[PDB]
Amino acid sequence: MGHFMKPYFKDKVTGVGPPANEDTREKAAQGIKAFEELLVTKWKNWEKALLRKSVVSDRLQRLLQPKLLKLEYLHQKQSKVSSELERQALEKQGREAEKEIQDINQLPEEALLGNRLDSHDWEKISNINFEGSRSAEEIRKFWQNSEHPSINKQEWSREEEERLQAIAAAHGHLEWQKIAEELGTSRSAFQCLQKFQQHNKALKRKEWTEEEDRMLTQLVQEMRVGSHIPYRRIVYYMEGRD
Amino acid sequence: MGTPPGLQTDCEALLSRFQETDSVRFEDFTELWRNMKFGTIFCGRMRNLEKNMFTKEALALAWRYFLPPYTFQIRVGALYLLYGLYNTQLCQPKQKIRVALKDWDEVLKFQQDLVNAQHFDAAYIFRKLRLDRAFHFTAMP
Amino acid sequence: CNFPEYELPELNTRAFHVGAFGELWRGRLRGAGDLSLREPPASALPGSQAADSDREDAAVARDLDCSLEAAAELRAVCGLDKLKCLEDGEDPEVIPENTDLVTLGVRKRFLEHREETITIDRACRQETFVYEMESHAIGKKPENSADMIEEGELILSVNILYPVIFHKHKEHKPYQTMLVLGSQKLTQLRDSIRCVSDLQIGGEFSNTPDQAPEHISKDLYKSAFFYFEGTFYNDKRYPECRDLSRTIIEWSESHDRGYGKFQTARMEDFTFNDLCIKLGFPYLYCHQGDCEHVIVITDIRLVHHDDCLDRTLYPLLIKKHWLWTRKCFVCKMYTARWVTNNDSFAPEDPCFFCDVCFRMLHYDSEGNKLGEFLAYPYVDPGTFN
Amino acid sequence: NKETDMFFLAISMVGTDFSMIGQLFPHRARIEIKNKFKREEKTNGWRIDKAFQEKRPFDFDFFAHLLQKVLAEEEKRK
Amino acid sequence: KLFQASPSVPAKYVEDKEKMLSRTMQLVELANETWLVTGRHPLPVITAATFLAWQSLQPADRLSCSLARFCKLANVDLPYPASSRLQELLAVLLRMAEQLAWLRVLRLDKRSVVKHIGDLLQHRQSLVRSAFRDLLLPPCMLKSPKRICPVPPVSTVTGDENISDSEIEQYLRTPQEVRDFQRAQA
Ligand SMILES: [Zn+2]
Ligand SMILES: [Zn+2]
């Protein structure tokens, strides 16, 4: 019974489906998205922990690779070369590279993490360290905007909330990047807007308006059968509800 | 879905008791029905959809008893149970017994046998259910 | 023979021709009036059968091969007073204690722990849609003569599963149940479905959000087809319609993919009476080139005078599953109307935004683009469910 | 264990004639008898010597019968 | 048949023939120099090397594939000791991975290492020469045998003429057992 779930037809030996159809190809060329794209999984603590591990590992390899490549090239040259003074100079270079790799080994994880806007091989991280389960750009956004330690993850202070409200009014509730910059607590535009919307009287309304009531009544009468109405789905059409 | 919680026990107890009486008369079945007071089953703070699907499944299960391989008096008791369940319901419209195509003809032959057997109580009860059109012409029960 | 049999107990049945099955049902009922759409006489208490006695006793005597006095005696014996131990005036909202039913003992056990100030309520019991649609349509008749169900017509129950699927549960399915007539063409069922995929739209509009596409997927594509008994039924009424079945035939017949030989037909060539179909066995439907639905023929029966006879409503909807609205991540409460990718402001990609949050975040008063992001208009299937 | 006791009693009865040994048991080859000897000698050289000294009367029917009975008993109880 | 987009195989598993050949060639020479080839069947080790090379050319998905699935896809009769040879090479792979700074810091494992084989091969020679100073021999006898070929006691004495005579009595049958032997195979 359960064998017939989507896709309805699936290849018996490989499980693949038919190639892209003409209608599907045109729709893709028109940029029409699919419903499967809306499926997103919550960041469990393991996902974050191994993202952190991946970032530290990436930075470690980035720092080490030039040093160890230099050391290995130097050792190859020392092995092939017979000149004594040049051999001693190459040996000294190898000792320097050894000391450099040792102090990099001794560097702390925080120094390895570096700044928020540092460069990383997000593509390689994605497809080799999480096997492509999450997209490289998605991982980049998550890290740089929420997970990197420089992000202000602390709870909002009451003074911070009051100043946020005041400067949001000052900025006309627009350009929330400038709002966050003026707040001065290293907050992001998205954090500021989410916070304001969660305590904005204009969005969440206890009162009512003529257009909201009219459209609620219209949708209710069009859809309602007996006692049932889409209480929480009417919110798509009118603004300021659940 | 299956069966309501406890309905199977009440139905089997009623059918077993009616069998042990060794009587096919409808008087005995109604007397048991009134004594243990089966008709309350359609009360008890069950709402509209609840009465509808409870009656549907109860009628389907009463039909399950009404079918073979159980012998004459068991099927007679099951028909009396079908009559009671349908005529003591409070649905609007009265919900119908789901009966299969494969079962309509066999029940018609059973009604004819009841007529030939001169036990006209069961045949009359089936005809009364037919007048109520208490049954739905379905492919499966 | 077209004799329905269980292929798996209470799960699915063998295949049979709908027309032949309906003809067999009518043959077992034609001329008896049991399949008629006209109100028959009903049972009553023995104290009120005097008016009905003249009409009933003679017919009973004729059918049961018993005397008129025997018919009257049977009627008195089978009086509802012998079974109506509830008075017609008793409310159903209370369990009557004068009973020995185990069922009502269980009902009492259920109700007792629901009378505290925290638990007492008259809320939904387990579902709502079914009875609402029933009471909205049951027993009604059409306002037009041409919209009347034929007496003894077949009623088919068809379930269509939603494109959005749980992927974590398998006992239950997300579906909507329709009722269709034997004589109806499949064109009506194809045209009736209001699937959200028809509302699908595309295009990237971060620079100019107000320039959303003028055409929904329904206005650009019309390819749709049904799948029964190995047959494709593709629509070709319009130039936008394409016979999707040809590509899948080419793909599948070239290799042992686990399915047999297939053949193509149009959508308007068949009525519900022309199909040879199973009950409970899953089947397939598709539209928009890619939006596949699972089709299950849950039930089939002749029409009854108590059923909905108003064909203006047909195809009928009688049961509907639920999908959760896609709430935008900014306020986490309001429903999203926009989604962005590559968005520097957004903490995650993709990020969904409401029409309120989207504009006020990504644009200034003039509507100029702010930051780096790509934005797409979004239609919520959890809303248009 | 009981099968070990059987090789010991057999080789008491008849000596170390692995061919006749393997014939009388139903599914044991001469190679199996040799391998069993090579395994057991280290701990049961005393028992092999006792068996060589134990020139027990080798009756055909008696031993065939007691075999069949004790194989049946072991199979049932095992 | 891994290198053509046949209908029976997904295109996911098509590569460059020369890259595959080079990966497998360098893996095979590594196995050779690590004493994994002498006195044994080459076909299982070669098969293992091919499987690991193919996996390493895209660890993203091939890490989920099994060698049994591999031979099914390729229509190849896998030798029974292929799994054992693969395990041996994996142990050698971990012994090699311990050498490099990044790998040893990352604390890799038998499975996750699949995505660094090219890196290892890049610096094979120096690292393996360093690792040898810690050789390979049959793992069965690498169990740290504290005693090797112990000298047996000298028992070259053969007596003078006869050390005992009851042995003949012990090795001869009594007349009872003689009759018993006669009736044994009647
Ligand atoms: Zn759809
Ligand atoms: Zn908003």
Return the half-sphere exposure (C-beta side, CA atoms, 13 A cut-off) of residue E92: 30
Contact C363, C370 (CB under 8 A): yes
Biggest alpha carbon–alpha carbon distance for chain B: 44
Find the helix packing angle between C102-112 and B7-20, rounded to 10°. Answer: 160
- Secondary structure element (H or E) that encloses residue C319, with its range: strand C316-320
- Please give the Cα distance from A96 to B122 (Å, whole number): 107
**Contact criterion met (CB < 8 Å) for E170 and D14:** no
Instruction: Give the ligand at the shortest distance from the Cα of C224.
Output: 1
**Residue (of C327, C363, C323, C377) closest to A203 by Cα position:** C327
3-state secondary structure of C353: strand
- Secondary structure element (H or E) that encloses residue B20, with its range: helix B7-20
Q: Do chains E and A touch (3 or more CB pairs under 8 A)?
A: yes
Contact C369, C204 (CB under 8 A): no
- Secondary structure element (H or E) that encloses residue C277, with its range: strand C276-277
Contact D3, D33 (CB under 8 A): no
- Please give the Cα distance from C157 to C316 (Å, whole number): 9
**Residue (of C36, C60, C70, C54) closest to B111 by Cα position:** C60
Distance of CA A7 to the CA centre of its chain: 30
Residue C129 has its nearest CB partner, among A24, A142, A228, at A228
**Contact criterion met (CB < 8 Å) for A6 and C385:** no
**Residue (of C366, C378, C380) closest to C208 by Cα position:** C366
3-state secondary structure of C349: coil
- The two tokens of residue C170 are 């398998």
Distance from CA of E54 to the nearest CA of C (A): 26
Residues of E in contact with C253 (CB under 8 A): none
- Please give the Cα distance from A94 to C174 (Å, whole number): 67
- Please give the Cα distance from E51 to E117 (Å, whole number): 13
Sign of the alpha-carbon dihedral angle for E79, E83, E84, E87: positive
The β-bridge relationship of strands C351-353 and C231-234 is: unpaired
Residues of E in contact with D60 (CB under 8 A): 183-184, 186
- Please give the Cα distance from B40 to E24 (Å, whole number): 81
Distance from CA of B23 to the nearest CA of C (A): 15
Q: Which residue carries 């390689």 as its tokens?
A: A124
What lies within 8 Å, CB to CB, of E44 at 6+ separation is E78, E79, E81, E82, E84, E85
- Give strand pairing partners of C353: C338
- Angstrom CA distances, A80 to B90, E40, E126, stand at 101, 35, 13
Distance from CA of C262 to the nearest CA of E (A): 19
Distance from CA of C41 to the nearest CA of A (A): 30
Phi first, then psi: give them for residue B104, nearest 5 degrees: -60, -50
Residues of E in contact with C255 (CB under 8 A): 7-8
- Please give the Cα distance from E10 to D75 (Å, whole number): 54
- Ligand 2 centroid to Cα of residue E144, in Å, is 71
Contact A6, C165 (CB under 8 A): yes
Q: What is the 3-state secondary structure (H, E, C) of B104-121?
A: HHHHHHHHHHHHHCCCHH
User: Where does residue B44 fall: left (phi above 0), alpha (psi -120 to 50 degrees), or beta otherwise?
Assistant: left
- Which strands sit side by side in the sheet containing C282-287, from one edge to the other? C263-266, C231-234, C224-228, C282-287, C291-302, C154-161, C175-181, C316-320
- Angstrom CA distances, C373 to A163, A188, C339, C376, stand at 28, 15, 10, 10
- Angstrom CA distances, E106 to A54, A56, A59, E131, stand at 10, 10, 12, 19
Respond yes or no on whether the N-terminal peptide bond of residue B5 is cis (omega within 30° of 0).
no
Residue B43 has its nearest CB partner, among C60, C77, C92, at C92
Angle at A129 between CA A123 and CA A106, to 5 degrees: 105
Distance from CA of C209 to the nearest CA of B (A): 46
Minimal Cα distance from C152: which residue of B?
B137
**Contact criterion met (CB < 8 Å) for E181 and D52:** no
- The two tokens of residue E184 are 């044994």
The answer to whether E180 contacts chain D (CB < 8 Å) is yes
Long-range contacts of D4-7 (CB under 8 A, 24+ apart): D4/D36, D4/D40, D6/D67, D6/D70, D7/D33, D7/D36, D7/D40
The reported resolution of this PDB entry, expressed in Å, is: 3.5
Residues of E in contact with D58 (CB under 8 A): 177, 180-181, 183-184
The β-bridge relationship of strands C291-302 and C154-161 is: antiparallel
Q: Which residue carries 């974050």 as its tokens?
A: A48
**Contact criterion met (CB < 8 Å) for C82 and B37:** no
**Contact criterion met (CB < 8 Å) for D55 and E186:** no
b/e per residue, A138-161, with b = 16+ CB within 10 A? bbbbbbbbbbbeebeeeeeeeebe
Residue type, B116: N
Chain D and chain E share a number of CB contacts under 8 A equal to 30
